[model samples]
Every structure is written in structure tokens, then in C-alpha cells.
Target: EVTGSVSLEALEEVQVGENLEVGVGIDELVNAEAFAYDFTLNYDENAFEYVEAISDDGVFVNAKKIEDGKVRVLVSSLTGEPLPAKEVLAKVVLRAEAKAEGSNLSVTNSSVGDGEGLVHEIAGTEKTVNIIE
Candidate 1:
């Protein structure tokens, strides 16, 4: 069985009026051969506004805000190779508002697929980001 987890990770603390970049993907993958994943991020839309989302792996990916505070992400490799280690499925970009205080970002409705088209078990979690001066 493939066991792993996907999470939203921030590289650093974000300040108001600054761009916040968060990585969304898996970590601590064990006995897994992940080839694709579908996930969503729920964030406080009042604190920050969605700028854009990008994938560094050159994979066929798509991202869109389906709800007021929800951004859906889809990613799949074309070569049928296992996912890279510690690689982000997608990078989410947002800009903190001038009056932003604090907000939360969480991953939900996440799934990972292996090379053979078998879905694996992966859980997600949330993180809180404080807007500093």
C-alpha cells in the first residue's frame, strides 16, 4: 500500500502588502510511486487575494478558484514516471492585503495516484499564517 501526505507549506512569514507563496504537495512519501494528484486549498480570502498558481515540474496542471476561498488544483505527469521527491505539486501565490492580520490555509479533498492508476491514501492538514508589519 502507498502511504503519504499532502500539505500546504510556507517558506517564510508573510507581511501585509507582500506576496505570500505557499507550496502545496506531498511530504514523507513512503513506498509510494505518485504520478498525479488532485487537491484544493481553502484560505481566508479577506486577508489575502489569489494571485496565481504554477507548477515547476512542467506537468500538465490546472488551477482555479472554484469558490470564494477555495482554489482547486490538478496535476499529472505525462511520462508516467514517479513523482519527484519533496517536489511541490503546485505553488500558490497570494497577496496579503494592507489591513490583513492573520489567516489560515488548509488542504482538503486531496488524492494521490500511482503509476498504475491506483489511488493511494493521503491526508491533509492546515496552517495559520500571521501578517506582520
Candidate 2:
């Protein structure tokens, strides 16, 4: 389990057995001994942070709250599947600032990739954002 802080504005609803993806845009693939990855996100009042645990084939992330408006995210590998080889992708929402309302942020994964090349070319287009309000 992961723990952190985030504003209510950036909080996301996640059903059990679902993945919590955050951030988008050409993330460089971090090579690990294996191929899997797991992630967790946290938030503070100023920025967001993330942590990743990798393995050999698949990856999953943990969830947390951002009381400070900043966030921390983490990734862990369970199934082990070319995770490090793949520039990971995911979408995350931005939270309101100290007094800023309607302040939202989103992330698209196609922007990230690994040694194989740009994730867009290799993955062939994927949706990194959803449900804009």
C-alpha cells in the first residue's frame, strides 16, 4: 500500500481491481533487471511525486491522497512483462491551487517511451486521458 497527500480536486475514484495511472507525455523507460512495474502516486500542495517498483513482465501502481495539492506516484511489478522496456503511459488530473478553482491537469502516456522508440509509434496510439470536467 502507498500513502501521500493530494487536494480533493485531484482525487480519483478507483474501483477495486483497477489501475491508477498518472501523468503522460513520453516518459523514458527505466530499465530494470526484469520487465514488470508497479506505481504509486502522492500529492502535496505544490507538486506531485511518484515511485515505481519493477520486475520482469507487468506493472501496477498504488493510490494515495494529496492533502498538500502535490502528489507522489509509485509503480510496482507483479506479472513481469517488458515494463522497463516500454515507456509507460497513463493519465493524471491536476488539482486546484491554494485559491485557484477549476484548475485541472491531465497526462497522456503516448508521450513516453523506452529504447524501442517513441511509445506512440510502438504502441500505435493509445488514450492517456479521460473524463474531462
Candidate 3:
């Protein structure tokens, strides 16, 4: 049995010095018991800079920048509360630093949690990015 899918979505094109918006989505909770989640988002540090993570209301969102362009994002229920079957956990804000092509945003090390102290792993998601003048 599968819990659901975690999605990383972003625009295909962005202008230099412009803002890039990326979406973090919890596709569908088959078990309907998703209480918490965490994932690592990877981007091209040379082409884009980390700005901020605007998350959904009523949840706990934490983001940490790791080595290079990797960001560890965590979303939680903040209590005994559970989430819906599908949701956009957060919108990641980024700044385009330079013009580039074939850049990508990837998601890995994803997991979903439950109040029962059980955590399950989910597949990663990826999106390509292109920068224009």
C-alpha cells in the first residue's frame, strides 16, 4: 500500500533577477493519516538563490539550507492535528541570479509521519529550470 506522492513543481522559464516560485505538494494521502512530512529540495546555487519558504497556514514549516543549493524542508501538524488528502504544503521563493539553461530543482529524502510515531518514505520529485535574459 502506498501513502501518497510528494511533488515539486516550478515554472519552466524565469528571467534573470526575477523571482522564481516553486510549489511543494502532498499529492494524496491514501491512508488519510498524514501528520508530518520532511523533504530536501536541491537547486542550482549558481543560477538561483534561496529566498524564503511561504508555507500553508495551520502547519509548522521549517527550512534549512545545507551545503551548496540543497534545502531541507519540514512540514508538520504542530499538534495532534492531521492534514487533508491533498495539499500544497508550501511555496518556495527563489531569486534568479543569472541566466542559465538546463538547471533543475530536485526533491529527495522525503517522508511522511503519523501521530503513532510511524514515518514512511516517499519518492522524490524533480523539475527543470531555464533562465532567460
User: Which candidate has the highest lDDT of all?
Assistant: 3
TM-score of 1: 0.86
Per residue, candidate 1 scores C-alpha lDDT tens digits across 5-109 of 786778446778788887887776777677888888888988878888888766777889997678988888877666675767688888887554447889888
lDDT tens digits, residues 13-98, model 2? Answer: 33322333444322342331322222323333332223332212244544344434333333444553444432443344443223
Count backbone clashes in candidate 1. Answer: 0
Instruction: Compose the digit string of candidate 3's lDDT tens values, residues 1-133.
Output: 6466787778899999999888887776665477888888899999989998877677888888886688898888766678654567777788999888899898889888876778888778788899998
Local distance difference test values of all predictions, in order:
0.78, 0.31, 0.82
Work out the TM-score per prediction: 0.86, 0.31, 0.88
Runs with alpha carbons beyond 4 Å of true place in candidate 1 = 98-102
Clashing pairs in 1: none
* Candidate 2 root-mean-square deviation in Å: 11.7
Pairs clashing within candidate 3: none
> What would the TM-score be for candidate 2 when compared with the true structure?
0.31
